[PDB]
Each structure stands twice: as C-alpha cells, then as structure tokens.
Design a protein around this nucleic acid. Sequence first.
RNA 1: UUUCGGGAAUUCUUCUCUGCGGGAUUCCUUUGUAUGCACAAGGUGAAAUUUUGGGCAACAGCAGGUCUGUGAUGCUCCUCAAUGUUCUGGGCGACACGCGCACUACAAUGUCAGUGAGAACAAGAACGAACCUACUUGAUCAAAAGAGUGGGGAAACCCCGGAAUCACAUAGACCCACUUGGGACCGAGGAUUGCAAUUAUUGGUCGCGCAACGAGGAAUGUCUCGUAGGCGCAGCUCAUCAAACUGUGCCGAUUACGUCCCU
Lengths: 139, 102, 184, 65, 119, 143, 71
Amino acid sequence: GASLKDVSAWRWIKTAARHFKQEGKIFVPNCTEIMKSSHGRERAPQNPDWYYIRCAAVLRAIYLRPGVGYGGLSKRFGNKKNYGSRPEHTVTSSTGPLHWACKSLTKLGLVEPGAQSGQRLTRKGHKFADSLAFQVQIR
Amino acid sequence: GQTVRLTITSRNAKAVESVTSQLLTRARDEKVTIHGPVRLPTRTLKITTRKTPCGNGTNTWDTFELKIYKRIIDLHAPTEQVKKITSFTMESGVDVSITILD
Amino acid sequence: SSKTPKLFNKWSFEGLETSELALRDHISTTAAYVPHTSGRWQKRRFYKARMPIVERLANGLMFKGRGNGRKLQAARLLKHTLEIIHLLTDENPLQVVVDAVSKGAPREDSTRVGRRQAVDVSPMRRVNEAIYQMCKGAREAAFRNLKSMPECLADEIVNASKGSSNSYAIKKKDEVERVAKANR
Amino acid sequence: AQVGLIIKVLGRTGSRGNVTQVRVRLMAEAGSPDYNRTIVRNVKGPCKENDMLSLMETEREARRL
Amino acid sequence: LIPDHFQHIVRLLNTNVEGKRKVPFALRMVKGVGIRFAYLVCKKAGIDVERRAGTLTAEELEKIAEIIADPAKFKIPDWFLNRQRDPKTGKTEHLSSSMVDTRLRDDLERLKKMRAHRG
Amino acid sequence: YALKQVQTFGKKKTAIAVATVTKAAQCNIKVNGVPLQQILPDTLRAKIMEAITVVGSKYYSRLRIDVAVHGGGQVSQAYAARQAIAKGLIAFFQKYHNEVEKAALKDKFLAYDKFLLIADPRRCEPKKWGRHSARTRFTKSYR
Amino acid sequence: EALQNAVMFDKETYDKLRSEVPKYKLITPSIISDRLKIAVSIAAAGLKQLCREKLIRLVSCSSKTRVYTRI
RNA sequence: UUUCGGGAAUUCUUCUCUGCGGGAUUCCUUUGUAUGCACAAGGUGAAAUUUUGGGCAACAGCAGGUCUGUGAUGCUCCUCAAUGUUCUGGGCGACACGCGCACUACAAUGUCAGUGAGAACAAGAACGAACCUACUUGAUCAAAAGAGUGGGGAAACCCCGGAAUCACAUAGACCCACUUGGGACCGAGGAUUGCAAUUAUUGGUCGCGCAACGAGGAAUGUCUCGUAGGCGCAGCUCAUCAAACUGUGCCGAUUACGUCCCU
Ligand SMILES: [Mg+2]
Ligand SMILES: [Mg+2]
Ligand SMILES: [Mg+2]
Ligand SMILES: [Mg+2]
C-alpha cells in the first residue's frame, strides 16, 4: 500500500488541489481574487488556482501536527519582508486566509474543531489523504 | 498516600549540596521511599555595563554573572513525619519549600 | 558489494591522469560522489594538495558578497557545467578539467626583488593560480549578459584545455610569461 | 621546458621574504649531457624538498644569499 | 505568431505605451495605475495576462480605458482607490493620466493659501 | 524470537542524530520518517548514502534503521545522520557477530572518511565586546 | 547596445527553429536566442515544444537550467 | 507489510539535565641536533602544543577624562521680582555646506509568485488584576485591529520553540533594459500608543517611482579556522519607536604558515 509521508510533498499537494477543483464543491471566497496572501508580500499570487493549492497544503499541515491553530500555520507560510532602505525582518502570514481555508475544509467534512484547542482531521479526512498518496505512487 | 515534594534553591553550590545530602540521610534513617534528588538546569543572570563612570577613552565593558542552583526531592510520607526530617540547622542562604502533589 | 564512486553518479574517475609531469603530485584524482566534504583542509601547509580537484573548483565560485558561503549552489552549477563540457568535446569531462588546470598558469614570473627579476613558480602555486584565473574569467564574462554562468564556465575550461588564446586564463598567462622573459 | 627536482632549500631571500632559494637537479636523460647537473634558482610560490619545477632556460644561476 | 496589427506603441489615455511588454506591465506606464491595480483591470476586462500589449485590439482598449476611468462601477472596492474622501468634494474616486499632476498642484496651492506649516 | 536492537548517536555542530537499528524482515532506512529516496537536495542525499555504498548494501540486508535528528541546520543534520547510520552498523556487528567481520567494516569506513565514525569537535567561537564578531575589530579613523 | 530581440516569433523565424535548431549540437535557450535574435522567454517556450514532439533530447534539467542536444 | 493517537500497561537510561571527579604529560618513534635546555615530522588519541576563547595582571608616569553618578569634597558665586523649585509654551530635530561611522543598492551565481525541510542564547505580572502568551472569534467576505475563553512564578505555558541564508524534476512569469533592477521623494483614506502626535510617534492599503545609482580618482580599515564574509533571532534602551550596542546560533571559503622593505 501507501500512505502520506511516503511520497513527495509537492506531488501530493498538486494532486489534491486538482481534485478539489474538478469536484467543484469547495466554497471559494470572493476575496481570493482581490487580496494578497500576506502583508509581507508585494504582489498578488500569480497562480489563478492559488486558493486550492493553499487548502491542500493546509490539509497536509494538519495531518502532521494535529491540534494546530491559525497562529501556528501562519509561521509555516511566512516570509521575509522588504523594507526599503532598512534591514529585513521576518513576518508571519496573515491568519485571515488561513481561517477561510480551515472553514472550507470543515464544510467538506475533512476537518473537525479538535478536542481541546486546535484543528484536527476527521476519519474521512484521514482516509482521503492516504488514498491520494497511493494514487501518487502509482502515477 | 500523599507525595511531598521538596525544593531546594541557593546562590552557592556548596551549601545546596550540603543541605540536600543531610535531607537524604535522614529520609533513609526514617525508612521512606524517595525519588531523586534531581539536579534541575542551572540558570545564570548576566549584566554587562561600561567600566568608565564618564564617556572618555576606549569603550570597555565588564560582565557580571550570578548562578542559581535547584534540586527537588519526592517523598512518600504524611505531613507530620516530613516535618521532623526537614527540621534541622540549615545553613544561611538556602531556601527550602514544601509542597503536596496531586 | 562496494563499487568505486562516480561524480554525480555519472562520470568515471578511472584512468584520470595529467600529462604535465611536474604537477602530478599536486592535482588530486581521488574518487568522490559530490564536491561537498566538509573537512579541515587548512590545518597544515600542503594538506590542501589532497583535496579533490572538482571540489577545489567549487570553492572558487563562492567569491563575492552575494556568493560567499553558498556551496550547495556551486555544486549545482558544476553539475550543469560538466554536462555541457561533455557535449562540446565528446570526452570525459573530468579529463578536460585536469587538462585545463595543467595549463592555466604561467611557469615563469617576475617579482620586485631586482626593477623586476624573473623567478620560477612552485607547482603548488601553478595549480592555485589556474583555478583562480579560470573562475575569475568566467565570472566577469557573465556579468551583464544573456549567457548563463554554466555556459560561460564551460567555454573557459574547454578553451584552456586546448591552449587556445580565446581563454581568459591563457591570455593572461601569455602576458606574464612574455614580460618575465624581458626581465631575465 | 626541462624539469628539475628540488633537493635542498637554501633559506628564504629577498625583501619581504616571498622568494626562496633552492638547488635543483636536472633529471633530463640518462646518457645525454645535462645529466646529474645541478643549479641554483629562485622560486616564487611555497615549495619544499622533492618538488618539481619547469625551467624555460637552464643557463642562468641565482646569486647566493 | 505575429499578427498584422501588432503595434510597437499603443496610445492609451494620452500615454505612449510600449507594445513589447506583457499587458499588466505595459498598463502600469499610465500614471495612476500600479502593478497591483493593473492586474485587477485585466481581470475585470477578461484579458489574459500572458499576452503582449501590442496584440490588443481597439475594442479591448476602450474597455480598459473605461475601467480605469470608473473602477467602482466594475465592483473594485473603495479601499483600493487613490483618492478616497476628497477634502474639497468628499467623493471617492481614482485619479489617472495627468489628473494626478493637476490635483497635486491643487493640493499644494490649498496648503499655501491658508499658510499652513506643510504648505 | 528475541529482539536484536542497538542505539547509536552522531553529532556535527548542534545537531544530534539518534539511530535505532533492529533486525527485521526487509531493509528500510528513514530519517525523521522520510525515506532516503525522498531527501532533498540530491547533493545531501548522496552524502547520507555514503554510509551504505562505502561498505556495500549486502551488509544492510534485513535491518530497519530509524534516525531522529534535532538541532543544527540543513547541512549539519545530514552529516550527523550519516555518522549515526555508520556507527549503528558497527555497533550492531559488534553485538551479534564476531570481531573479524566488524574490523573489516571499520577500516573501510576509516579509509574513506574519518568523520564517518568520529565527531568533528569544531564549535562557534564566542563574540567579544569591541568586535563585531569573534575577530573583526571596529573601524578606526585617524582624521 | 540596441539588442533588438523580438518577442513574438514571426513565421520566418519559426521555420528556422523547426529546421536547423534540431541539427545543432548543444542547444540552450541563450544559444539560439542570439542566433535567431529573439528574446530568451520565447526561445525557451519554443524549445519546450520540440522536447514534447521528441525532435530534440533533454540532457540536464533544473528549475532554472535546461540544456538539450540532437537525436 | 507499513503508518497514526504531544488508548492504556509494564521496564529502562543510548540521546537531555549536573555537583564532584577522570583525561594531555613533548607521553612514544625517528630527524637534524647543539651534550644540556629544546625544535621538526609522524604516532596515540575526543583533543597534540600556552588544547581553544576569555578574566585577572607589577613598578613608574600623564597637570589624559570626569566637580552632568552619589547624602564624595576645599575655596569661591547666587540666594525671595533667586543660578533654589514648580508649572505653561518653545528649543536640543532649523540648512542648496564640510567631515567620521552605518544601512540600502546598482541586477540573471537575479527579482517576483508558490511549495519543502529546519536553530541557539534569552525574557515574562506590584482582593484579585495591572506582564508574557496559545486557541477561536471578528468572517454569509481586506489588511491590522476589536473582542472572548484559557495557561504560565517560568526544563511545567508559550513549545514538538514551524527564524532567515538554503532547497525544489515548480515541466511558473520576466530576458540585458535605468527594465518586473533600485526605492528616495511626495498625495489620499484608515487604525493604534499616550495626559498630549502640528513644529517630531509607529504599523497597514492604493497611488508616485520620470531621484540618483550601470561597480566607484588620489587615498584608506579589518582579518589566519567553524575564522572572514553572508544570514536572521533575543536582550537592552522601552507607554509608543533599532539603520546602534551586548550576546546567540545557521551557511561557510581564498591565501600565508614568511620577512624586516614600510609603520
Ligand atoms: Mg534585496
Ligand atoms: Mg570607534
Ligand atoms: Mg522603473
Ligand atoms: Mg571623485
């Protein structure tokens, strides 16, 4: 068989995002076409499917490290910001888009509000991630 | 029964080892089950400042340090029995606290 | 079931040799998989003569403030460079680079002991100088240019191995050796 | 360009100490002239015994010390 | 492939725009349109951002000029615009193509006439 | 039917790798849960794979090796991992084989690299006041 | 250095890409950019097509570097 | 067969924590010795020459600095419309100029948009709360910021401390141009700290970018191994603000291992 973490991270993320787009029941918010992924960026995302890729990356990031919140995920998706004539510093990503991503995955039935504090995968979400991993291995 | 945790803290390494040793000898004399002693990580407080009282000359600094030592001991005894073990002439500069765990 | 290593799992170290008899003890042809080794090669005086030659090339690409300390990037540039060298010459790329190192430095120089006075060049200095001049010539050729660094470095190396004057290193070697003859 | 073998290092010379004086043996052939010949030269880089040299002209000699 | 109507300079809002550039990066040559704004104009006009500006047609130019003139009619939010509550008129608008320079001269004359510190 | 298991460690700068080697049904080497063929970049993967190819893969025939690495950075963690794997094979052969085969593996590792089995003692030098780094003094101006 | 490199690949230079570029040894986006006087962006797109139709063979690939040769 | 729970149950100290100990001595071999004191190369080894890096450091002096650290001080000056003290406002921040020390760059060994893996030193509040933080809410639609439950006397919470250089077989965009390089200067909304933000707070959004700058004359600073250089992170100052300082880790070289030409 196969499971997540036995396959390449990018190929899993790319395959899952393509799955979300084709099934067509995901609830993309309207602000995804207007906003930047974080205030540490300078331009808007250049991939028109950037929201599906972010949702798939969030799902993989909850499979590892269950019980994670929006603040924890914002460290994973942060970057270094260009202040003009001053030195650079690290900024965490905006948590608003991460809040939308978890809400979308909850409406699909893949994420649960977690036991004590954070976010968690459901049994359906765990089944989805491993079946996708086997498809990637088969190619 | 209950479990009593003893915490020993001091500024001087020698006195903290002296106090912990006698607390262990008397506990074994009274035939009590013991956990530890545990040497917790030692912390150092640093302060660095200019040596000159004014602003003249080459800028030189001196750094002062201060070390804190900590040990803990766990006992299985009632409160009255523990007090006899704890009571003796402890050296100056050593703090000993008593707690009951859950 | 051990087998001998090949660089980037592709290029063979078997039969590697230099035709310059005077440099045979200062160019190391030891087999390895990748340039990275993370050793203490500057502890003694001549210990650096046992560092494998392709890694010495990689250490010559981490030069300016933007390039200092980037060894993994230098390894990737060399991997692409060797493939282009093989296409251009149809020979073993490892043999081509040791030929270039054997020719890229002047055998006679003039120093300021005497005006100037002509002296001979130690074999250790000949291999140090060949690597330095070949990397410097390729870095300047790619500064504001459509050509990539791998393409610029490949041309410099194949020209040096042929003794062609189109190489940066060969051109400077002809000037230093000509001036030294004047100050004999 | 003949080849010579360094058999002795006669100290470091010149102002600033970047030149070394050595004596070298012209290996050459086995029966031909310039065989077992010795000569004293100045060398620019770092060198030690048993190093080999490439000599463009084997006719000049270096002044001692 | 090259079309017969490829133009090396396209005239848009009294500005000469270089036709060799990608569409969003040729539209930022208009005063009042930045890189963030130019991408949004292409989205509301239904233009692929991977084309070159020299292939744009006459009907495509009129649409782009109309979006830039009134971005709020095409559902571009107010926080995106460069003059949100005009100190004289109170209306939210976007300024472009030499209205940027005229309004700048108006603002400095406003501060000098009342003799404020900034003006 | 007993458990044949050993544990070793390796260190480079601040990274510490701990390897558990156990006899199993099929060979399997993982680092922090990731199989070796998934490790990136290829340069660092070939560095770790040296602990296998130097002696040969026939000596890892039915061994399951799991490596946990913490501390350090991208490159020092790769170097600590390969040291833990090489030392793990020696420790396993010392416990469940005789001395002739172990000594034959040990000198092959040492003939290739000393740091495959012995840790590098280098550490960062402390910073001093009046200097920007360990050794760089402040800029001096005369006029 | 005017360097008037075209960005849109007219029909005359399309023939040259499909006819003689395959006959070259050591194809690279920068190498045929100046032989045909076209921008590197459309040179790399034109070479990606020939790799799909199996007219040239890929030799070394990376996220930023690609070098081909003849069949 | 693998994988998951920051189920449960036994037993155990490889990794972590630390008070006192061990360990290196030119110890062993061979050179030249110059037969004494020693040296060079190798061996042993975690480490091989002051093991590495710091702290401490004699005697004599300087009319060096500090009377803006003190309830350390002689002499002298002011002392009720005070040179004492407090309160209001302004200034210490003014500028077509000169000099020292920094920060950001001039691009393709790059900029932008994604995705991966992955440190160390630290800090946290005075009848409960004034300090630091996680989580979810705000959200049937922007950043950042309102707000609500909790936790932490700090190996216990933050925290499995998801740092930035870095990597990517990402089939992504740009193509040698003052250009998607650079980001100075300025315009218009809005929020936050504070008793008070204009003469001077600080984040965030759209615009300006048409301001120089395409590698820098004579001169000149620092540096020999986990070093230089590059990269971020803590502490300090602190209600609010770090292009500084004091520390910490990460990536990681070229060259010499010499001399008395200059100082
Ligand atoms: Mg930058
Ligand atoms: Mg100074
Ligand atoms: Mg511009
Ligand atoms: Mg000048």
